[PDB]
Design a binder for this molecule. Structure first.
Ligand SMILES: [Cl-]
Ligand SMILES: [Cl-]
Lengths: 85, 11, 85, 11
């Protein structure tokens, strides 16, 4: 599959949880970005699709205070903006 | 549903 | 699919990351147990299949200092021991 | 490979 190139904030984010390359499959981008959200426990305790981005590297990348995981297009759109595909 | 599941459902 | 009943240590572990039931599909047991490992960052930074269990609730449940994720049977065997299927 | 991927490979 094609390799995508994370922009700096998202590269910093992926590396912060042990990714070690400049280019990645989308599938790996999604693995490490999930790992990161859980590693920092930014998910809501009771409604676990809600992610809190305020005052985190993620909110700097995404440009929102919070989002819902269920909004698939919205999440891909935010991710692609942080990638050179 | 866990965050992990919801996440996995993006694919 | 069948619902399994976590034994107390593993129930404590699943609840510690927001699972809210006494019975669960295996698939959900595996989702929350993965979430937990990442939430506590027990995975090795450089070789990410290695999980450190020393001095954690997980090592009390599993009965090991460390394990490799790649040892599929071994991981299921440890999990079933912590479940009434 | 991330821990997340290795984990997902259990299923
Ligand atoms: Cl990597
Ligand atoms: Cl639950």
């Amino acid at each position: 599959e094609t390799l995508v190139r994370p922009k700096p904030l998202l590269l910093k984010l992926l590396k912060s949880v042990g990714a070690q390359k400049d280019t990645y499959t989308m599938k790996e981008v999604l693995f490490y970005l999930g790992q990161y959200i859980m590693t920092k426990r930014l998910y809501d305790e009771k409604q676990q699709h809600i992610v809190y981005c305020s005052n985190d590297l993620l909110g700097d990348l995404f440009g929102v205070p919070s989002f819902s995981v269920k909004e698939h297009r919205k999440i891909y759109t935010m991710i692609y903006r942080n990638l050179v595909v | 549903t866990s965050f992990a599941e919801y996440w996995a459902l993006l694919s």
